[PDB]
Design a protein around this ligand. Sequence first.
Ligand SMILES: O=C(O)[C@H]1O[C@@H](O[C@H]2[C@H](O)[C@@H](NS(=O)(=O)O)[C@@H](O[C@H]3[C@H](O)[C@@H](O)[C@H](Oc4ccc([N+](=O)[O-])cc4)O[C@@H]3C(=O)O)O[C@@H]2CO)[C@H](O)[C@@H](O)[C@@H]1O
Ligand SMILES: [Cl-]
Lengths: 385, 74
Amino acid sequence: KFKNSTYSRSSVDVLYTFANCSGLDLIFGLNALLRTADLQWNSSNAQLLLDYCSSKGYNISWELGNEPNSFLKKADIFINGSQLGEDFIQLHKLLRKSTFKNAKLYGPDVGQPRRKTAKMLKSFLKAGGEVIDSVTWHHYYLNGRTATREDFLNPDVLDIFISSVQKVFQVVESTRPGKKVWLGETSSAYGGGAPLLSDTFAAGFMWLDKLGLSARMGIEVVMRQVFFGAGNYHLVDENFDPLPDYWLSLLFKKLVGTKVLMASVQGSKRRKLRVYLHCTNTDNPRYKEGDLTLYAINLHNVTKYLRLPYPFSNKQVDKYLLRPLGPHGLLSKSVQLNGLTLKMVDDQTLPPLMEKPLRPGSSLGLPAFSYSFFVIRNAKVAACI
Amino acid sequence: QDVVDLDFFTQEPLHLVSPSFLSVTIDANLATDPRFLILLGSPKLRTLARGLSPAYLRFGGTKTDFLIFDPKKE
Ligand SMILES: O=C(O)[C@H]1O[C@@H](O[C@H]2[C@H](O)[C@@H](NS(=O)(=O)O)[C@@H](O[C@H]3[C@H](O)[C@@H](O)[C@H](Oc4ccc([N+](=O)[O-])cc4)O[C@@H]3C(=O)O)O[C@@H]2CO)[C@H](O)[C@@H](O)[C@@H]1O
Ligand SMILES: [Cl-]
């Protein structure tokens, strides 16, 4: 079904200037299906693009191929993981001879690790693992065409992610121990997303839980499909309005730090009350070194009250509770933070994200079908300094 | 009751994520939209993207392997 298309210097410029003006680091996927007579990668088009990007001084990171596990179905071409690693070694030589000698290379952007994908990933890392900066793989929970509201709220669907992560680390530890692992493309549902679900408050349970598990389990970077585009799983719709998952992503960015800790609920039964703990983001002016950020998901149909353990029981806690704006409930495209609708002040100004200070010693209230961040002030955690 | 005690492990970081841990994509498919320049030129969209800085922006997707650079096309 997929036909070849061309893109211009103009398109490359639009994309780079978007990323540069936005403070984002561009990673550009090169075409892996350009093949010589003997199914070697033909680097000649990539050479034209590297030279053009060098000639503009564009600092760009590279990938080569997308979901190579599916190249037979997509293009009736089979490239094994060995051959792909060899293709990456050839791209590495081109980057090392370019103006940006230390430019980074990520791959192989495999799908989630079913037996044949895991086999391709293993043979890829055996062959080409020395030249990649991080191992990239993709994850979606559901087909957007058949996904239900119940699926977006089901801990049994959320939990399938854990077995995919464990399987990717089993392959990486067997081949390139210590190599960083990235989720290179991820979202709720493929096929463009689940209509009236992937773009709503309901999408946030899967997004926040995936961030929480990815961080807990050792994944270094998670790339959300998509910031902007046609699919229902966009953070920002084609009218440039942010969807609930944008505001969730912005809060996560402001509050959640790089140092991952652990939280768990007593009596175990980690199903519908999901909890994650990091050090607070040191770039948030409001907070100081040693502060904790707890984030929690309540998939029960009743409010739950969380009690903080000693020695954090009597600390001042700042609540950041997200709830949908009615009347569409979990299927709303609008969200309130502590009862204030999140909306841009104008086209150049994000709103302030206002905290709710709780009464010290009070239990943390988490309404039914909600998610919240909680910053524990003056936590004085030595791990977080 | 609906009251739940948390347990916390705080002795040391269990992992370190990137400062760019929460990153985003633009699907290769969008470069085939005629309005690609209008869309990504949007000052509102750049304001929104700046909010998630620092982050990686990955340009890729199925169309990655069906896109060819043409230096003439301008
Ligand atoms: O007419 C339409 O709009 C058709 O939409 C298709 O979905 C598109 C997405 O809209 C598009 N994303 S975008 O909106 O941001 O541009 C793109 O998404 C792909 C992505 O490119 C790709 O890497 C990913 O591939 C897989 C493969 C396997 C699995 N898996 O777990 O088995 C998951 C993901 O899939 C993304 C995706 O499907 O969302 O491209 C798709 C497909 O073209 C619908 O497929 C069509 O039904 C619509 O007619
Ligand atoms: Cl290595």
